[PDB]
Amino acid sequence: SGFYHKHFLKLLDFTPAELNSLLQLAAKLKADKKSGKEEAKLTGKNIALIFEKDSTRTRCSFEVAAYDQGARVTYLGPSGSQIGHKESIKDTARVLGRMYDGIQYRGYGQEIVETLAEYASVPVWNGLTNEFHPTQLLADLLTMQEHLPGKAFNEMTLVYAGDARNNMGNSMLEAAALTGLDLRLVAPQACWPEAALVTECRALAQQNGGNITLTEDVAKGVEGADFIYTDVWVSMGEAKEKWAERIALLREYQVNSKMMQLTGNPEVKFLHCLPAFHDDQTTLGKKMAEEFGLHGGMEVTDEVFESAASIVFDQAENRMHTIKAVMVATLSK
Amino acid sequence: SGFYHKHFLKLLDFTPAELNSLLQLAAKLKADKKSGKEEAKLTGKNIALIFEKDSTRTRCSFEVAAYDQGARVTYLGPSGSQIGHKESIKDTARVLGRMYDGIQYRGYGQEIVETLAEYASVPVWNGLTNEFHPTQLLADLLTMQEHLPGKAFNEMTLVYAGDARNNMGNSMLEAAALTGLDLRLVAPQACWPEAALVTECRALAQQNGGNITLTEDVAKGVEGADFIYTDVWVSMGEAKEKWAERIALLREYQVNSKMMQLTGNPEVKFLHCLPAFHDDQTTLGKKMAEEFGLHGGMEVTDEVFESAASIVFDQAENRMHTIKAVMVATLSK
Amino acid sequence: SGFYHKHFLKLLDFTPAELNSLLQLAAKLKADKKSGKEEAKLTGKNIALIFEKDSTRTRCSFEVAAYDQGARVTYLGPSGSQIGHKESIKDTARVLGRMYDGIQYRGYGQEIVETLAEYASVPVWNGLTNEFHPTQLLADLLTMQEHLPGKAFNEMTLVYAGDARNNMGNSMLEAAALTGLDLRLVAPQACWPEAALVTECRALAQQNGGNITLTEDVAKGVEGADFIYTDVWVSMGEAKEKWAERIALLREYQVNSKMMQLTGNPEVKFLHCLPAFHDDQTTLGKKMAEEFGLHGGMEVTDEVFESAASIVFDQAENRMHTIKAVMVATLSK
Numbered sequence: 001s002g003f004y005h006k007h008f009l010k011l012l013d014f015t016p017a018e019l020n021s022l023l024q025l026a027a028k029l030k031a032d033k034k035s036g037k038e039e040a041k042l043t044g045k046n047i048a049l050i051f052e053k054d055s056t057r058t059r060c061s062f063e064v065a066a067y068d069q070g071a072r073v074t075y076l077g078p079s080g081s082q083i084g085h086k087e088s089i090k091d092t093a094r095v096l097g098r099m100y101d102g103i104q105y106r107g108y109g110q111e112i113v114e115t116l117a118e119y120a121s122v123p124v125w126n127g128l129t130n131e132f133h134p135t136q137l138l139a140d141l142l143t144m145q146e147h148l149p150g151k152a153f154n155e156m157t158l159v160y161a162g163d164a165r166n167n168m169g170n171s172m173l174e175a176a177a178l179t180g181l182d183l184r185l186v187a188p189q190a191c192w193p194e195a196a197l198v199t200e201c202r203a204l205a206q207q208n209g210g211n212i213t214l215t216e217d218v219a220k221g222v223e224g225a226d227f228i229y230t231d232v233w234v235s236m237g238e239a240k241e242k243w244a245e246r247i248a249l250l251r252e253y254q255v256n257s258k259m260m261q262l263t264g265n266p267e268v269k270f271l272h273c274l275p276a277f278h279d280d281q282t283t284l285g286k287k288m289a290e291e292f293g294l295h296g297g298m299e300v301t302d303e304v305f306e307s308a309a310s311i312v313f314d315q316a317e318n319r320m321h322t323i324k325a326v327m328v329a330t331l332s333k
Numbered sequence: 334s335g336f337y338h339k340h341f342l343k344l345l346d347f348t349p350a351e352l353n354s355l356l357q358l359a360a361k362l363k364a365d366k367k368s369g370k371e372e373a374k375l376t377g378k379n380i381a382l383i384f385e386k387d388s389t390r391t392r393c394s395f396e397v398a399a400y401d402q403g404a405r406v407t408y409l410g411p412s413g414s415q416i417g418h419k420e421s422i423k424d425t426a427r428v429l430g431r432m433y434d435g436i437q438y439r440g441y442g443q444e445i446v447e448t449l450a451e452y453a454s455v456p457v458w459n460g461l462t463n464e465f466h467p468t469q470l471l472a473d474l475l476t477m478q479e480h481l482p483g484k485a486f487n488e489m490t491l492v493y494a495g496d497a498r499n500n501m502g503n504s505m506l507e508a509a510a511l512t513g514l515d516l517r518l519v520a521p522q523a524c525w526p527e528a529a530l531v532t533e534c535r536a537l538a539q540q541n542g543g544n545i546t547l548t549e550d551v552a553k554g555v556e557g558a559d560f561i562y563t564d565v566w567v568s569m570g571e572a573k574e575k576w577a578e579r580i581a582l583l584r585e586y587q588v589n590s591k592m593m594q595l596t597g598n599p600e601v602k603f604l605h606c607l608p609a610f611h612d613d614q615t616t617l618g619k620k621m622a623e624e625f626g627l628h629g630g631m632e633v634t635d636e637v638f639e640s641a642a643s644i645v646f647d648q649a650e651n652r653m654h655t656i657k658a659v660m661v662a663t664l665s666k
Numbered sequence: 667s668g669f670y671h672k673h674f675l676k677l678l679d680f681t682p683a684e685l686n687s688l689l690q691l692a693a694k695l696k697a698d699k700k701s702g703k704e705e706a707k708l709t710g711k712n713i714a715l716i717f718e719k720d721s722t723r724t725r726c727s728f729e730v731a732a733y734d735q736g737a738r739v740t741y742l743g744p745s746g747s748q749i750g751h752k753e754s755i756k757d758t759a760r761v762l763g764r765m766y767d768g769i770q771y772r773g774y775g776q777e778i779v780e781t782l783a784e785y786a787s788v789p790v791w792n793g794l795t796n797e798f799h800p801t802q803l804l805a806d807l808l809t810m811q812e813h814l815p816g817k818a819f820n821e822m823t824l825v826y827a828g829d830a831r832n833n834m835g836n837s838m839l840e841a842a843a844l845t846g847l848d849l850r851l852v853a854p855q856a857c858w859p860e861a862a863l864v865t866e867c868r869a870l871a872q873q874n875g876g877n878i879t880l881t882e883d884v885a886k887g888v889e890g891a892d893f894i895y896t897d898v899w900v901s902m903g904e905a906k907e908k909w910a911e912r913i914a915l916l917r918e919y920q921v922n923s924k925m926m927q928l929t930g931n932p933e934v935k936f937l938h939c940l941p942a943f944h945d946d947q948t949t950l951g952k953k954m955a956e957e958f959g960l961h962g963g964m965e966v967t968d969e970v971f972e973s974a975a976s977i978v979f980d981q982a983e984n985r986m987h988t989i990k991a992v993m994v995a996t997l998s999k
């Protein structure tokens with residue numbers, strides 16, 4: 001179909017060729033900004049940014065991408081608007097679609113963003129839901145490509161360790177499906193994503209020359225990895241009781257120097273969508289470090305996080321370039 | 334001019350003539366935007382948006398309107414600044430007035446917005462107070478004209494059912510005073526607006542060929558109505574302790590299909606300033622529904638809300654074009 | 667020397683000459699805006715505004731200053747982002763430095779803004795920390811220059827009364843160190859600023875033709891004052907419990923007409939960084955009045971605050987012109 005006037009709710013709504021085009025557009029916009037040759041395509045466009053959860057990267061990416069492109073934005077945060085508590089999403093979508101050219105939504109159930117897209121009458125982009133986080137994967141893939149230039153995604157081995165059933169796990173399944181990556185989801189069975197989704201995506205991944213492996217075996221799982229990726233063990237919005245349960249299950253899947261060693265690959269790089277709990281320099285991070293005896297980092301150690309192998313800030317930067325591409329592609333021709 | 338640097342705090346501060354001019358400006362600005370011939374008149378202008386209460390429509394109307402007109406905005410929400418608690422309104426006014434070209438204020442007592450207007454030295458616009466919501470009526474009036482083209486306001490019958498002593502009830506009175514509408518406030522005597530304002534506003538409406546009827550009788554009260562309007566029974570900022578007494582006094586005044594049929598006009602349309610509790614798709618909407626046994630809708634039924642007679646979203650869109658007229662008229666020329 | 671691509675974290679990181687240049691740029695920018703001859707130098711720049719505390723003057727100064735100069739801003743308030751609770755400052759700094767051209771930070775410990783500066787890779791400006799509030803002094807100095815034309819700072823006597831160990835007391839010390847002001851901190855001993863800073867700053871102030879006097883004696887400290895300055899007795903972030911002890915200790919240092927009279931100078935002017943508790947018009951201002959028997963105001967009486975001698979709003983206005991100078995001086999040649 002293409003991107004013009006299309007929503008961006010999850011990756012599987014696009015073809016491998018579409019995903020690839022988006023990535024090339026992101027790379028091009030990245031270079032034009034860096035060279036002072038950026039051509040504003042969204043001048044005069046007004047964009048609404050709905051956030052029902054906290055955000056630094058996604059919030060800032062949409063803001064900077066919009067401003068660079070000549071657009072203006074309205075940030076509607078977790079509090080201060082009628083959204084959710086006093087007004088239905090169907091109503092919110094119908095009001096915003098009459099005033100804005102595009103709408104970003106970060107929140108809970110994927111069904112909320114789906115309903116918004118159905119009733120907005122303008123492009124709606126998923127800035128993170130409980131089930132999927134498509135723009136993140138766009139940033140991740142562009143980063144991997146830049147770090148293994150002249151290496152097709154189907155020549156790459158990517159390991160995602162930890163909670164494989166959160167939005168990132170699901171998104172990992174989608175990206176392999178459209179790229180042919182050799183995806184390894186290294187986690188305990190209790191944190192494995194939906195079998196039906198794994199089946200669908202593995203078939204598609206193989207079709208593109210890759211595979212999808214779900215294993216509890218760290219050694220076998222990370223062998224030959226080009227990239228090890230992780231994320232917090234309890235996501236935004238989950239009840240705090242999930243920490244005890246999750247840490248008991250996932251502490252052995254922490255990304256630390258031993259795991260980096262187990263890949264047998266001196267060039268392996270480390271990725272993390274962020275925010276990360278890698279030291280005691282955050283309120284909640286210090287809380288959990290003491291409550292669960294995790295000193296030196298949780299899902300990843302500060303050692304790996306700050307090591308030469310870590311490319312999380314290149315990854316974070318790309319969040320803005322890929323989000324700019326999504327808005328340019330869906331709002332201009 | 335005539336509007337130049339004039340505050341917009343309530344409708345009785347204007348004449349029928351001024352009202353028509355703003356409505357005409359709004360209509361022109363609406364067509365210019367849609368046709369793409371919008372000429373920015375507020376380039377370089379900086380506007381402060383003080384919000385002591387939640388907002389989706391008003392917040393977005395001021396932002397989009399300002400952006401379309403080349404102005405910039407600073408959103409000062411319920412949290413984050415010194416307003417209310419740490420600093421007097423008088424002080425806040427004199428500070429903002431030294432930095433901004435205009436100030437929108439949404440909050441509590443009308444005296445706050447009057448004090449702000451007193452000391453700001455720049456135009457102040459009321460984006461809702463406990464007593465009045467003038468920008469909403471501009472949108473409503475424009476919407477009605479568009480839906481009964483060619484008809485003058487004294488040729489239209491408008492019914493407002495429910496809590497007639499909230500900000501909307503007072504603003505309906507004001508609107509009738511300046512248009513000569515045949516206004517019917519259908520509500521229990523306990524929710525009737527202040528007699529003094531009714532009397533003042535009735536004399537003026539009649540001068541304009543209209544009238545103001547306050548009746549507890551629904552059947553006779555809605556006969557011949559061109560429009561049926563309603564709003565939530567407990568307004569933002571009112572003690573939650575008021576819901577029981579309100580629901581009991583007002584549930585009989587719910588805008589449902591029986592009320593619509595009672596007008597005897599097949600062309601009757603439904604208006605609601607929004608947000609509306611018309612189903613179980615909102616947090617407090619679902620809670621109050623099950624708490625008082627009101628499913629399928631509260632002040633309005635989902636059935637009427639979603640019917641072909643409902644024009645609430647044309648009405649919501651008009652919030653932006655009319656707020657734009659207000660800023661353009663008072664800041665420009 | 668210069669400001670180009672330098673941080674602005676505290677005054678002592680600059681020379682008397684650099685400060686003077688900044689103040690002159692502020693006066694120019696102020697005059698240019700007023701004459702409608704302002705030339706935007708930050709067109710296309712994107713700035714992140716981190717606020718961990720509330721703000722009206724600083725928030726709006728940064729927004730208006732940026733808009734006037736063609737830059738855009740992303741307000742990251744006390745809630746809605748990952749800052750501090752979910753993500754460390756090093757991480758935040760490295761993420762924002764990849765997307766923005768400049769970062770403003772208002773919060774707590776000075777070490778937070780220093781780390782931010784160390785890791786951002788872009789200029790970061792201190793919009794207030796527990797220890798320093800440099801942009802405020804720029805506004806104060808410009809207002810003093812403007813109100814005592816053709817009198818060098820070292821020909822002026824400045825009195826700061828009250829809690830002299832908060833960010834404002836420390837900043838007064840720095841300001842006197844760079845200008846040669848005859849500064850008097852009229853405050854009880856328990857509230858005198860740290861010894862080492864007093865010593866370092868007095869030598870520099872003297873080098874510049876001024877002095878720094880700490881005294882518990884009001885009459886002696888305010889004699890011959892050209893300006894009397896004060897601030898709230900309990901600062902943002904400090905425990906509410908401090909009010910009890912602070913009022914008992916500082917009540918004697920309230921700025922009232924008697925203190926103005928004790929200067930022996932008919933032309934003495936009054937300054938206050940704001941917010942100010944000078945009447946009951948505040949939430950936590952009405953109470954503390956009745957609760958602690960403080961009538962007429964707290965750190966300052968309403969009589970003094972509203973008197974002809976008060977120039978607090980010229981001072982507040984200058985917060986914007988000086989913050990504009992800071993961003994222009996650091997982001998452009």
Ligand SMILES: N[C@@H](CCCN[P@@](N)(=O)NS(=O)(=O)O)C(=O)O
Nearest residue numbers: 055056057058166235236273274
């Ligand atoms: N599983 C996590 C994923 C967080 C992604 N956060 P990210 N890279 O989009 N930055 S943020 O600053 O915009 O939050 C969760 O749901 O909590």
Ligand SMILES: N[C@@H](CCCN[P@@](N)(=O)NS(=O)(=O)O)C(=O)O
Nearest residue numbers: 388389390391499568569606607
């Ligand atoms: N009586 C109600 C009126 C709400 C008007 N809300 P409205 N049309 O201005 N949209 S909002 O999204 O900006 O709140 C009350 O005071 O709660």
Ligand SMILES: N[C@@H](CCCN[P@@](N)(=O)NS(=O)(=O)O)C(=O)O
Nearest residue numbers: 721722723724832901902939940
């Ligand atoms: N010592 C005080 C100083 C407050 C400065 N506040 P100011 N002139 O920057 N306005 S504000 O509206 O931006 O807060 C304290 O730390 O609480």
